[PDB]
Design a protein around this ligand. Structure first.
Ligand SMILES: C[C@H](CCC(=O)NCCC[N+](C)(C)C[C@H](O)CS(=O)(=O)O)[C@H]1CC[C@H]2[C@@H]3[C@H](O)C[C@@H]4C[C@H](O)CC[C@]4(C)[C@H]3C[C@H](O)[C@]12C
Ligand SMILES: C[C@H](CCC(=O)NCCC[N+](C)(C)C[C@H](O)CS(=O)(=O)O)[C@H]1CC[C@H]2[C@@H]3[C@H](O)C[C@@H]4C[C@H](O)CC[C@]4(C)[C@H]3C[C@H](O)[C@]12C
Ligand SMILES: [Mg+2]
Lengths: 100, 66, 1341, 352
RNA sequence: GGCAUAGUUGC
DNA sequence: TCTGAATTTACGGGCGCAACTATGCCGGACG
DNA sequence: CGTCCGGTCTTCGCCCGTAAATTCAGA
């Protein structure tokens, strides 16, 4: 956003809803805002090998089929990691509480 | 370690409530251990005032009286 | 063209790619699997025929007699599907099979037997699968979920570094059979190969080899190359193949024919190999050190002593060389053991083990299998024969044999079920080669190694398991029976087969209670691919490998639709287009591309086959003829997306939506949503509740109609015709003349299922959607079930949504609802609840259902009738009495004048003890049905007689109207036939309609047809009479209730829960929320026109969880409702049809290159008015999954209406009347009501019933229990200074009987003080430790 | 005998029915299902309930909205006691029947008893001590608990269908413990770190960020204002936009003295929104903490400084007021999101 | 009113 | 031919909390 | 319907710790 009606132009911090809602720190961060407009970055196969051709389209433009397939690799791995890491976290906190 | 530190406690009740109940109970029975129930889990199991917060005065009275 | 069902509401489509393969029958897997389980198979490969031919014929241990198989038949189901659901018995058909028994007499290997005897024996009941793919087992609709287990065959694993922690990647070969004992070949850190059976104790591999009757020299020859050492003159001249000299360092100076090819010390190079190859060197002198390390191939004997000199598989030395020099052994055989290409694994295996003879191996393996028993040769031999060489105890499937041969690069794909020596030899050779380095192990999670067990295969397996037991019984009895005395009835016992099949269909990890609250829920539960169940994984064992999505899941298994929780990835859902191969592997369609022309033929490719090809993505732009416009098209050759040339393409994805589930394909703008939120959206789309009225989602995907019609919720028209009589509970179709079968006339009747209970307390209601005199076509929809609209699946409603924070009432994800949504009752949902009271034949006399109850006046008895049962239609409320039963099983007999003292007091306390069937507290509704079941000889009460008479009259009625419809059609057809060849019309009415058997017609086949229809009339009348009598007998007869129950009374409530703060609601893009306030309509934000919004969501829920698909859906729905509003305005003031059709065509033609192209010139200006009438509430939009509407087209559709192009309007506040700056997003998102209602979650407890073992409160809400103060909650209190609160929590309020009693009484007295006491749970622990030899006691203070 | 004791040590667990190992005494006093981790360290408790939670942003930080039906079910003994104390029912049976029938007089009794009787709200996975906190009940018509928005960060509890349990302390010691240790007012700072754990989360922070910001030019830019009060008067009347650079006269009290607040009047150059917010801040804080954009971290630092300088009651009142104003002005802002807000970088064509 | 299984919800 | 050490192998224990719905079950084989 | 005694087929995870058996490295 650049606003001026009293003479020369002057830049200012934008009012854009996504940027306001991210800079304010309410919800979202650099990663998510980047994924909305910019290319959504590098995603890795479950082996850990990073795919040569990453998703070159954001969420505003549509993700073609294979880009979505890579994205679901990532998301499924994340959900499984959550579901099978909560167990280790619970065990660790139980052990710590029963020590001290 | 935390596991071994909690398993090897002066009072068998805490370790028994922790993992390895069979081994801890076997150790206590063989050695004829005795419990002073001076912890938190132990009083919780017994079901009396905790020696942590508002019950600390009550346990101070306990230590005074005997 | 359109089939007159889509001509009522032409759903606008934005797709670009033209559909090639239409969506197949979505329930194809279940239907086909069971169809190949009950249909007779002449070849004997499928179904019960396979099992019977596998087990039968059966002989005795001696050639006495044999029982053999003829053919099997499925009888008429005793009870119909609706009757089975109502009564509660399994929907099954008796299994009747013909068996012929023959007896072999003395010297009768082929001679004629003494007699032949046959009967149609009965073996149990086989549950049947209804037209919807579901089973009915005990009155509940259960569906068998297909299983995805490891295919039988041979698999090679790595276990890279987790074992031995030294970087030694092992290699173990597993031979998984379809049924039998596993055989695992394994390596060790010492490079010695070991075999383990059934994953029992490990043992050296050569034990099995020797048990196969192989001598050590034979094994060495089989598994190694031979090097010939010749004692020609001296120095032990050697035979050398130059090809084997590459990869090592020459330990000597190589020379032959006077040429020093390589000097001493320098390794063997490539050029040295070339020199040796070109000079054709075959014999070379060698030093005496070269033999020092080699191994003798085969055992050798001496001519002096006549005994052994060097055992097979032992390292030769100078001593052995000297000993054999005088033995005359000029020619010597040695095995070639290269260090890094051909390791000496088998030699070390032979050296390590102690066993040497076959019997030694047999006894060792017998000891391993059977520890403790004194071994014997006979038992060991029988055991090893039965382990891997018996057709009964071990059986590689046909698919197993195919995979086993394929993994070993064999040629034939058929063979014997049992293993063979060659098979084990080849498996071990392949394992050795993999260990060397040539070849690669096979990944476990490849979709080419996981079959799809459907219900048919599992049912066949369980049936075979039952046949094993019945065959054992028959064989045991077949030796000890008087043959010529009985038919083959006592021969076969039906108990085992029936028990096994009932156990499988009733209680199994794959026989699941059906998630029945949406058509989508049913259709996605039937297409479920579960990795759990027998023969498969367990959710707490596998992980991090089977959970994740593999590159081969493309096109076969949905990646994004999988439940989140303990089992994520193990409960995958089948893709839309995926089929099942003959062997059971998942295959998906592809479009053949021979040359640059994209042919229109579809090839299905299994996972393994897809690998050796290259397939183009669906989104490949084409021209009219079909040619990839871009010279380099993206494809996927070997699990790797890459940009290949226009030429190399061999296949193209059939459609852009073949990678998703049938449930995840309904999420519009799916490509714009992050995978996590798409998964959540599908999961909660499965859980919507059918509202009172469906509302045709404005922004769909075009897959709604397929899902709705395929799932058995709508009443699709079996034959096209013209509707004749359609009321709220019946549809009658007059079959067209063309489609009418020759003979029976024969006009279809559809009985709609009115309000009935579902498996999740939801109402399954079918209502007609066609008017009288409206034609219909085959496959057309006549009635739409729950959450359906005109054949389109509409789970929830859509309403005007506005994304903006509103006073914090939508803080985290909460949703603010306008009171208009409640007023219109568009989220009101009908829940049908079933309550049953039983009269058990308990001691102290039976129980009675009389209306006379004590301790309650006539006020509580007002709703009950004279028979102690509530009226149908009573507006019952919580705490009332439904079926007042009082038990003669009451209380004690007179004790010390108990009754005398009661009479003295003034009150009559009798054996009449009040039980009651009271509605659960806080539940209101209406009684819609009462059904009473009574065993024979119990004298059903007056209400039972009345309901029985009503049901009998209703059955006689329904049959009478069925006959009347059939005869109306029959007489109409006869009249139509009469119009040619002497038509009588003036006097035809004079004679009665029935008296058409005296008609005067000429000599042609038309009078033959009239006589055929007379025969049809006779058949209809007689069968009507017989069926009426049979139905009356069925109604009047008793019921096979549970043992000891007199009568059961089931009362069906119908509660209506509209909406309230707490009811969870979510869109389709994984945006959840619980209603926070039923805001007044005047307080809501409203636009300039003055239309208040309905829902106010939270904008902050968009960025963090990147489900931008909901924003685009909001814009598209806003545009669709703009078009609908334009149509509604053009229709509110009457306008010429010309302008209306012009506008509708302009709307339907809007797009970039849409492939719908509906022409309105062929609607006759009459259907157009109906189209406008149905479109006035917003034009439906179809948006395929990954070929959806781009944002530019959304802008165009906005601009067609008067709406703003940016998608954001200016909203004025409802309360303060002032404008909101920063104009907001407003539109019509399609939102659902999830089946998580607050009143189903709210729960509280002061004090109620307690448990028994530990005197603690009960757990749960179905029983009036209390919350669990878990361990971390106690830690939370301990971290606090909360001591007294904790003691009160886990001492007084939980299980201190004296403590809780005194606390209750003190609180009643108004004093808040407690007696701590001691918990009784600790007393339980003390007693349980004392039960052992552990003496635990509390010492004196 | 071995099977009767720890079963499964030798051979196989002998099974009795349907091929599942039988529980033995050792298996009955060991493990997750034993009497230790199932009925000793954690026990089912009466006077408890459960339901879905809801926002209810009108509540103060020290109270929670309890459904009326749950309130009636939980406090049944207390209602009996009050009914007998007032003599409206001689026998417990009569009081029980009166409570069941839900007369018009029982509700007044429930209101009388709920006055100063804190209840504990405890979400399912109580990871840390803040997972359980006490609030004073407020009778709410409905079936869902209305929980104060600020403590959601403490519970890690969004409003997408989360359920929380209620617990009713009975004894005087338990009530005093809840009031003096477990009220949300006393739990401002997390035990792990000194940072506050009631920082405004999602809508309050957006509202404050929108309020305290400056654009180059807005309605009534540059005018001089005599104080925050007329700044609010201007904004409500619509004369000057919420974000307009102006000059305001500020009275900021600093306590540099020996525990005395020393006034100071100056002319600060800020925006209308900043002044309107400054009308909420207590006396003892400097104005410089409201002259910035007030992101989430800035608001958290504001609250932390308020706690450090003033005390506890000022910080609790400040949290309530900051939540209220943030919600109000976020609503007034109408900060929405649209597909045209995710602007593509038109110059990414050359980059790609 | 206790066990087993299946499914589901929040983390 | 013995004998202590370090290593390897075998085998015992752990794998979070809270809540809701449904079904099936005490066992199938002799008087 | 009423009483009354009990055993073929199944493995199939990962990590850690501690105790038992095997093997060095000598004397
Ligand atoms: C007819 C077909 C061959 C066609 C060429 C072969 C190939 C694989 C065979 C099925 C699988 O083996 C699994 C299963 C094994 C059971 O034991 C018997 C039933 C099952 C369903 C088999 C029936 C049939 O035999 C199949 C379909
Ligand atoms: C329209 C149609 C004419 C076809 C030539 C006639 C022929 C037979 C008629 C039905 C039957 O009578 C059974 C039943 C009797 C009830 O009382 C009223 C409803 C029913 C369904 C009737 C409606 C209608 O009248 C029918 C379909
Ligand atoms: Mg939540």
């Amino acid at each position: 956003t650049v606003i001026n009606r009293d003479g020369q132009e002057e830049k200012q911090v934008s009012f854009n809803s996504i940027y306001m809602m991210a800079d304010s720190g309410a919800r979202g961060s650099a990663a998510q805002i980047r994924q909305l407009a910019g290319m959504r970055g590098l995603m890795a196969k479950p082996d850990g090998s990073i795919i040569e051709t990453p998703i070159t389209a954001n969420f505003r433009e549509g993700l073609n089929v294979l880009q979505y397939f890579i994205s679901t690799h990532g998301a499924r791995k994340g959900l499984a990691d959550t579901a099978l890491k909560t167990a280790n976290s619970g065990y660790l906190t139980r052990r710590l509480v029963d020590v001290a | 370690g935390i596991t071994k530190a909690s398993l090897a406690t002066e009072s068998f009740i805490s370790a028994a409530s922790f993992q390895e109940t069979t081994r801890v109970l076997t150790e206590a029975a063989v050695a004829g251990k005795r419990d002073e129930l001076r912890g938190l889990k132990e009083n919780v199991i017994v079901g009396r005032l905790i020696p942590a917060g508002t019950g600390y005065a009550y346990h101070q009275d306990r230590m005074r009286r005997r | 063209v359109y089939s007159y069902t889509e001509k009522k509401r032409i759903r606008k489509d934005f797709g670009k790619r033209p559909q090639v393969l239409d969506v197949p029958y979505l329930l194809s897997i279940q239907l086909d699997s069971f169809q190949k389980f009950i249909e007779q198979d002449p070849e004997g490969q499928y179904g019960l025929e396979a099992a019977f031919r596998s087990v039968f014929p059966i002989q005795s241990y001696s050639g006495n007699s044999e029982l053999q198989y003829v053919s099997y038949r499925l009888g008429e189901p005793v009870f119909d599907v609706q009757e089975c659901q109502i009564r509660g018995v399994t929907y099954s058909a008796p299994l009747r099979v013909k068996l012929r028994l023959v007896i072999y007499e003395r010297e009768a290997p082929e001679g004629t037997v003494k007699d032949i005897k046959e009967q149609e024996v009965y073996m149990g009941e086989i549950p049947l699968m209804t037209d919807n793919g579901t089973f009915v087992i005990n009155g509940t609709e259960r569906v068998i979920v297909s299983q995805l287990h490891r295919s039988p065959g041979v698999f090679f694993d790595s276990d890279k570094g987790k074992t031995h922690s030294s970087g030694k990647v092992l290699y173990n070969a597993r031979i998984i059979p379809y049924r039998g004992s596993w055989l695992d070949f394994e390596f060790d850190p010492k490079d010695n190969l070991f075999v383990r059976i059934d994953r029992r104790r490990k043992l050296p591999a050569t034990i099995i080899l020797r048990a196969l009757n192989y001598t050590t020299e034979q094994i060495l020859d089989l598994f190694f190359e031979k090097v010939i050492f010749e004692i020609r003159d001296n120095k032990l001249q050697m035979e050398l193949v130059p090809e084997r000299l590459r990869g090592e360092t020459a330990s000597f100076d190589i020379e032959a024919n006077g040429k020093v090819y390589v000097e001493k010390g320098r390794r063997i190079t490539a050029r040295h190999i070339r020199q040796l190859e070109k000079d054709d060197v075959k014999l070379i002198e060698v030093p005496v050190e070269y033999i020092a390390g080699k191994v003798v191939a085969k055992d050798y004997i001496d001519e002096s002593t006549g005994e052994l000199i060097c055992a097979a598989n032992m390292e030769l030395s100078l001593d052995l060389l000297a000993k054999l020099s005088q033995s005359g052994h000029k020619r010597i055989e040695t095995l070639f053991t290269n260090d890094l290409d051909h390791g000496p694994y088998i030699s070390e295996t032979l050296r390590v083990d102690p066993t040497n003879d076959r019997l030694s191996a047999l006894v060792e393996i017998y000891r391993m299998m059977r520890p403790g028993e004194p071994p014997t040769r006979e038992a060991a031999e029988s055991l090893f024969e039965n382990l891997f060489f018996s057709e009964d105890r071990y059986d590689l499937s046909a698919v197993g044999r195919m995979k086993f041969n394929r993994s070993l690069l064999r040629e034939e794909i058929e063979g014997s079920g049992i293993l063979s020596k060659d098979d084990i030899i080849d498996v071990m050779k392949k394992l050795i080669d993999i260990r060397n380095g040539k070849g690669e192990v096979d990944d476990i999670d490849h979709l080419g190694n996981r079959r799809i067990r459907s219900v048919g295969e599992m049912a066949e397996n369980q049936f075979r398991v039952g046949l094993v037991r019945v065959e054992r019984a028959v064989k045991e009895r077949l030796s000890l029976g008087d043959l010529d005395t009985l038919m083959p009835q006592d021969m076969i016992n039906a108990k085992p087969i029936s028990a096994a099949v009932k156990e499988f269909f009733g209680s199994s990890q794959l026989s699941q209670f059906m998630d029945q609250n949406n058509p989508l829920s049913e259709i996605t539960h039937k297409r479920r691919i579960s990795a759990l169940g027998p023969g498969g994984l367990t959710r707490e064992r596998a992980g991090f490998e089977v959970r994740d999505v593999h590159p081969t899941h493309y096109g076969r298994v949905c990646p994004i639709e999988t439940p989140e929780g303990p089992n994520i990835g193990l409960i995958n859902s089948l893709s839309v287009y995926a089929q099942t191969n003959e062997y059971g592997f998942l295959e998906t369609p592809y479009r053949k591309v021979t040359d640059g022309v994209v042919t229109d033929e579809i090839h299905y490719l299994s996972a393994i086959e897809e690998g050796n090809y290259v397939i183009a993505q669906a989104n490949s732009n084409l021209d009219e003829e079909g040619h990839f416009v871009e010279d380099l098209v993206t494809c996927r050759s070997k699990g790797e997306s890459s940009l290949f040339s226009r030429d190399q393409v061999d296949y193209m994805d059939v459609s852009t939506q073949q990678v998703v589930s049938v449930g995840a394909s309904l999420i519009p703008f799916l490509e714009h949503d992050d995978a996590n939120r798409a998964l959540m959206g599908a999961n909660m789309q499965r859980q919507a509740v059918p509202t009172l009225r469906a509302d045709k989602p404005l922004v769909g995907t075009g897959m709604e109609r397929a899902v709705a019609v395929d799932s058995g919720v709508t009443a699709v028209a079996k034959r096209g015709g013209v509707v004749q009589y359609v009321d709220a509970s019946r549809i009658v179709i007059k079959v067209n003349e063309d489609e009418m079968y020759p003979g029976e006339a024969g006009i279809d009747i559809y009985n709609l299922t009115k309000y009935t209970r579902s498996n999740q307390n939801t109402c399954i209601n079918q209502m007609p959607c066609v008017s009288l005199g409206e034609p219909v076509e085959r496959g057309d929809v006549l009635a739409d079930g729950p959450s359906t609209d005109l054949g389109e699946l509409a789970l929830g409603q859509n309403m005007r949504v506005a994304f903006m924070p509103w006073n914090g009432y939508n803080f985290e994800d909460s949703i603010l609802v306008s009171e208009r949504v409640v007023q219109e009752d568009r989220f009101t949902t009908i829940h049908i609840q079933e309550l049953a009271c039983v009269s058990r034949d308990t001691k102290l006399g039976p129980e009675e259902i009389t209306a006379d109850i004590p301790n309650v006046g006539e006020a509580a008895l007002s709703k009950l009738d004279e028979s102690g049962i509530v009226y149908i239609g009573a507006e019952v409320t919580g705490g009332d009495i439904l079926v007042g039963k009082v038990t003669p099983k009451g209380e004690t007999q007179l004790t010390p004048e108990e009754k005398l003292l009661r009479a003295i007091f003034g009150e009559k306390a009798s054996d009449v003890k009040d039980s009651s069937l009271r509605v659960p507290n806080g539940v209101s509704g209406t009684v819609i049905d009462v059904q009473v079941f009574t065993r024979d000889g119990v004298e059903k009460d007056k209400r039972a007689l009345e309901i029985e008479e009503m049901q009998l009259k209703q059955a006689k009625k329904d049959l009478s109207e069925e006959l009347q419809i059939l005869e109306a059609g029959l007489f109409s057809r006869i009249r139509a036939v009469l119009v040619a060849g002497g038509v009588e019309a003036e006097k035809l009415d004079k004679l009665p309609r029935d008296r058409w058997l005296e008609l005067g017609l000429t000599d042609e086949e038309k009078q033959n047809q009239l006589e055929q229809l007379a025969e049809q009339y006779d058949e209809l009348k007689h069968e009507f009479e017989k069926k009426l009598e049979a139905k009356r007998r069925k109604i009047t007869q008793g019921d096979d209730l549970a043992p000891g129950v007199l009568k059961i009374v089931k009362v069906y409530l119908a509660v209506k829960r509209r909406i309230q703060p707490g009811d969870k609601m979510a869109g389709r893009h994984g945006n959840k929320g619980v209603i926070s306030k039923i805001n007044p309509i005047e307080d809501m934000p409203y636009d300039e026109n003055g239309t208040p919004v309905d829902i106010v969501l939270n904008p902050l829920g968009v960025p963090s969880r990147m489900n931008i698909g909901q924003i685009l859906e909001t814009h598209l729905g806003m545009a669709a409702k703009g078009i609908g509003d334009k149509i509604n305005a053009m229709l509110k003031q009457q306008q010429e049809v010309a302008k209306l059709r012009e506008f509708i065509q302009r709307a339907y033609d809007l797009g970039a290159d849409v492939r719908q192209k509906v022409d309105l010139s062929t609607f006759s200006d009459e259907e157009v008015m109906r189209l406008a009438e149905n479109l006035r509430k917003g034009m439906p939009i179809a948006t395929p999954v990954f070929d959806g509407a781009k944002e530019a087209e959304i802008k165009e559709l906005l601009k067609l209406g008067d709406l703003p192009t940016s998608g954001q309007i200016r909203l004025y506040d409802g309360r303060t009347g002032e404008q909101f700056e920063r104009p907001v997003t407003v539109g019509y998102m399609y939102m659902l009501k999830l089946n998580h209602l607050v009143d189903d979650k709210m729960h509280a407890r002061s004090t109620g019933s307690y448990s028994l073992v530990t005197q603690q409160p009960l757990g749960g809400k179905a029983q009036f229990g209390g919350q669990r103060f878990g361990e971390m909650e106690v830690w939370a209190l301990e971290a606090y200074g909360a001591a007294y609160t904790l003691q009160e929590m886990l001492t007084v309020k939980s299980d201190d009987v004296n403590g809780r009693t005194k606390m209750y009484k003190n609180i009643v007295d108004g004093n808040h003080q407690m007696e701590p006491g001691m918990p009784e749970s600790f007393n339980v622990l003390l007693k349980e430790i004392r039960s052992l030899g552990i003496n635990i006691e509390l010492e004196d203070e | 005998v071995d099977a009767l004791l720890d079963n499964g040590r030798r051979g196989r667990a002998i099974t009795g029915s349907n091929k599942r190992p039988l529980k033995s005494l050792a298996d009955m006093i060991k493990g997750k299902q034993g009497r230790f981790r199932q009925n000793l360290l954690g026990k089912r408790v009466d006077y408890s309930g459960r339901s879905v939670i809801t926002v209810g942003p009108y509540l103060r930080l020290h109270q929670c909205g309890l459904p009326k039906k749950m309130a009636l079910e939980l406090f049944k003994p207390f209602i009996y006691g009050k009914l007998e104390l007032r003599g409206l029912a001689t026998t417990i049976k009569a009081a029980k029947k009166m409570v069941e029938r839900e007369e018009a007089v029982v509700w007044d009794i429930l209101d009388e008893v709920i006055r100063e009787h804190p209840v504990l709200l405890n979400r399912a996975p109580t990871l840390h001590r803040l997972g359980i906190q006490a609030f004073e009940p407020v009778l709410i018509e409905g079936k869902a608990i209305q929980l104060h928005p600020l403590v959601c960060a403490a519970y890690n509890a969004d409003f997408d269908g989360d359920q929380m349990a209620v617990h009713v302390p009975l004894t005087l010691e338990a009530q005093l413990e809840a009031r003096a240790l477990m009220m949300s007012t006393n739990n401002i700072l997390s035990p792990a770190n000194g940072e506050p754990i009631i920082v405004p989360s999602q809508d309050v922070v957006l509202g404050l960020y929108y309020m305290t910001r400056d654009c180059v030019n807005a309605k009534g830019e540059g005018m001089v204002l005599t104080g925050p009060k007329e700044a609010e008067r201007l904004y409500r009347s619509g004369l000057a936009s919420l974000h307009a650079r102006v000059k305001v006269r500020i009275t900021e009290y600093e306590k540099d003295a020996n525990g005395e607040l020393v006034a100071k009047t100056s002319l600060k150059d800020t925006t209308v929104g900043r002044a309107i917010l400054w009308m909420i801040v207590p006396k003892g804080l400097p104005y410089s903490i409201v002259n910035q954009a007030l992101g989430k971290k800035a608001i958290s630092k504001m609250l932390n400084t308020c706690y450090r300088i003033l005390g506890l009651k000022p910080t609790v009142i400040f949290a309530d007021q900051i939540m209220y104003t943030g919600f109000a002005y976020a609503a007034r802002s109408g900060a929405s999101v649209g597909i045209d807000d995710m602007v593509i970088p038109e110059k990414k064509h050359e980059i790609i």
